[PDB]
């Protein structure tokens, strides 16, 4: 399967380098603009602002790993050592699963605000959104911890080893973990946003739009960008239970920067919370 090995090498060296390189540029400029916009324009934060700022911190953590990941794919090996293997493996999964959760909680916030514009409920308080943001970081850190435990069992002390559980280690345990993480990390938050879009549609039909716009964009972005990656991570593991295996790995490589395109485009959500932040950004410039 020398032909498929040539494809794997080219995909890593050229496709991943270029795609992550573009995400690094677009993501850094977009995230630093919205972060500085909040640091200099927003004086009294609500729940949605808290979640959006956390989303940018998650995106920025991921964007900071890209020079290391691009250099590793461009050169064909991991050379950064054990500490940076664990920290990068953490950040990549953490960014993926905190991002959809912050958008899920923003969606619930937009629904509660549609029913209770004056934010009288405890669930609508700024301090409660801070508590939920901290819960999101803790939950996601815990979802990612079995992968880190597995990595610490591999010979990372060698300095040039940083394995992917999708490609290495017991396929039976990697599949159970990958499928549970697909369910809890992806399908469940997506389903919750779908449920709250439906609750929003029903509320507005009774009372007879912007709240619908944010949630619809979130459902579309995550359905389109996360689905190929979650299918291929699971298919990559299942195939390990030949040329077919290398061909599946090539499909899997293709899906990875597509899921992380989310971190470069999700600063758009700052402009969908009805505060005219875009207009506020221009006033300061």
């Amino acid at each position, epitope marked *: 399967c020398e032909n498929w090995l040539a494809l794997e090498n080219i995909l890593e060296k050229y496709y991943l380098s270029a795609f992550y390189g573009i995400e690094f540029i677009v993501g850094m400029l977009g995230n630093f603009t919205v972060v500085f916009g909040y640091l200099f324009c927003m004086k*009294n934060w609500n729940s949605s602002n808290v979640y959006l700022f956390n989303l940018s911190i998650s995106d920025l953590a991921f964007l900071c790993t890209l020079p290391m990941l691009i250099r590793s794919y461009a050169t064909g090996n991991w050379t950064y050592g054990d500490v940076l293997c664990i920290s990068n493996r953490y950040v990549l999964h953490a960014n993926l699963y905190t991002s959809i959760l912050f958008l899920t909680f923003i969606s619930i916030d937009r629904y509660l605000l549609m029913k209770f514009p004056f934010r009288e409920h405890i669930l609508q308080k700024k301090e409660f959104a801070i508590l939920i943001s901290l819960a999101v970081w803790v939950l996601v850190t815990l979802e990612v911890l079995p992968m880190l435990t597995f990595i610490t069992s591999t010979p990372i002390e060698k300095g040039d080893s940083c394995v992917d559980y999708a490609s290495s280690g017991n396929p039976k345990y990697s599949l159970i973990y990958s499928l549970c993480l697909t369910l809890l990390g992806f399908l469940i938050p997506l389903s919750v946003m779908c449920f709250f879009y439906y609750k929003m549609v029903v509320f507005l039909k009774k009372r007879s739009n912007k709240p619908l716009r944010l949630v619809v964009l979130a459902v579309v972005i995550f359905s389109v960008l996360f689905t190929p990656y979650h299918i291929m991570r699971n298919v990559r593991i299942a195939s390990r239970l030949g040329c077919s295996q290398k061909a599946i790995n090539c499909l899997y490589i293709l899906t990875r920067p597509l899921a992380f395109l989310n971190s470069a485009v999700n600063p758009i959500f700052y402009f969908l919370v009805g505060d005219h932040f875009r207009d506020m950004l221009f006033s300061k410039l």
Partner: nanobody
Amino acid sequence: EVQLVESGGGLVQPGGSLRLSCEASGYTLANYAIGWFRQAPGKEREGVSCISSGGSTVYSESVKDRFTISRDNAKKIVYLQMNSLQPEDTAVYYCAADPFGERLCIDPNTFAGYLETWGQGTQVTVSS
């Protein structure tokens, strides 16, 4: 460019009614959202009612079955009809104007923070 003055503040017996007015001075009020807020001594400011430039109205849960917000763009006035007032409604009532007419009423307690146009406030006292 608008200036606001609230009026109608007074003494009400519990269960009594009172109408406040928020009058504007400037070119036009048409494109403005107008929100009514109140602050009791030692308490935080809280929104009570808001009217968008399109005429949509929103009410806080504590005043929903009792207050009515309305506007007359020709007289450039916004009224707050307050019925069944209780001692807990004692506060200085203020009106605020948002030039983004469809913005304020989405999230009045948060979006009030972005506004530069406020009235001086009018005292409403509910005591037996």
